[PDB]
Amino acid sequence: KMRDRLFFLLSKYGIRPRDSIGQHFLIIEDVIEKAIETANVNENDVILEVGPGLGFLTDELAKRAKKVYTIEIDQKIIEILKKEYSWNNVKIIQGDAVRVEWPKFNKVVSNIPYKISSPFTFKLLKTDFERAVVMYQLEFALRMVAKPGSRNYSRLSLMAQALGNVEIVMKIGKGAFYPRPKVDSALVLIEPRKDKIVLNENLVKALFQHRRKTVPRALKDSIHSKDEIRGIINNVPHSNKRVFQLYPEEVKDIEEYLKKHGII
Ligand SMILES: Nc1ncnc2c1ncn2[C@@H]1O[C@H](CSCC[C@H](N)C(=O)O)[C@@H](O)[C@H]1O
Ligand SMILES: NC(=[NH2+])NCCC[C@H](N)C(=O)O
Ligand SMILES: O=S([O-])[O-]
Ligand SMILES: [Zn+2]
Ligand SMILES: [Zn+2]
């Protein structure tokens, strides 16, 4: 009946899905149910969806939340959402989710298009927010929940996990969308830590440039300074590890070491 509803709307509004903006519409009702459940949506919450699509998940958010802001790049979809839904509590915002100014919000419950998985996520992590539930292409969600010491551990993994408990909650097959995509998706929960770990971005970029290296060699080789600081390198914390083996905590030990020696 969500599948039936979808094909109803396709013909009705003569919709031509654009894969260039990742137009794969969700049509399994349980995935909406899970997302809502996981986000524990309530009558006080101000939600931020990206890419409302045919507005299925938006419709479910809107009837549970105080307010919903949703950011749609496709102006035609926006013309449809307005004519099909009667949302008293949804503000629709035309533009690129990455480019436009975000309004204030305490939870995210959205699909995240493939081509903005990385910018969106980094933008979200720079934000004050109580809970995110965001569906990603499966590789990217696997990267986000990679643990220190796996190959797919990277800057994203670190920067995410420094801010929140990051876990995959269900895996969603490609049969769950129309058009059918090339890849599976995952629903990811992000819970802000009380114990937030905040790290110098430039240092992280530096370390993770060649992340398969030792912390000392990675530092030696990442003078963004003065090369004449070999003295400090040998006493660097966590010198036995390689960068891809570091937790946010050990990265902070390295940061605080370099501040103490006025390298930052
Ligand atoms: N950069 C971007 N900013 C905002 N919306 C975007 C976008 N790139 C794609 N979109 C929109 O995001 C949606 C992704 S596919 C549809 C989402 C899915 N039906 C859902 O459960 O919400 C499409 O509506 C697409 O037009
Ligand atoms: N498998 C887990 N969910 N473990 C971590 C705790 C997450 C839990 N949903 C919370 O709200 O804190
Ligand atoms: O394909 S969008 O323009 O409805
Ligand atoms: Zn359920
Ligand atoms: Zn150590």
Swiss-Prot record:
Record function comment: Specifically dimethylates two adjacent adenosines in the loop of a conserved hairpin near the 3'-end of 16S rRNA in the 30S particle. May play a critical role in biogenesis of 30S subunits.
Keyword field contains Secreted: no
Key word Lipid metabolism present: no
Major localization listed first in the record, in broad terms: cytoplasm
Chain residues that bind S-adenosyl-L-methionine: 24, 26, 51, 72, 96, 111
Organism of this sequence: Pyrococcus horikoshii (strain ATCC 700860 / DSM 12428 / JCM 9974 / NBRC 100139 / OT-3)
UniProt cross-references to SMART domains, sorted A to Z: rADc
Cellular localization per UniProt: Cytoplasm
GO MF annotation terms: RNA binding; rRNA (adenine-N6,N6-)-dimethyltransferase activity
Cellular compartments per GO CC: cytoplasm
Record keywords, A-Z: Cytoplasm, Methyltransferase, RNA-binding, rRNA processing, S-adenosyl-L-methionine, Transferase
Entry protein name: Probable ribosomal RNA small subunit methyltransferase A
PROSITE patterns named in the record: RRNA_A_DIMETH, SAM_RNA_A_N6_MT
Alphabetical list of HAMAP family matching this protein: 16SrRNA_methyltr_A (MF_00607)
Pfam family of the protein (one): RrnaAD
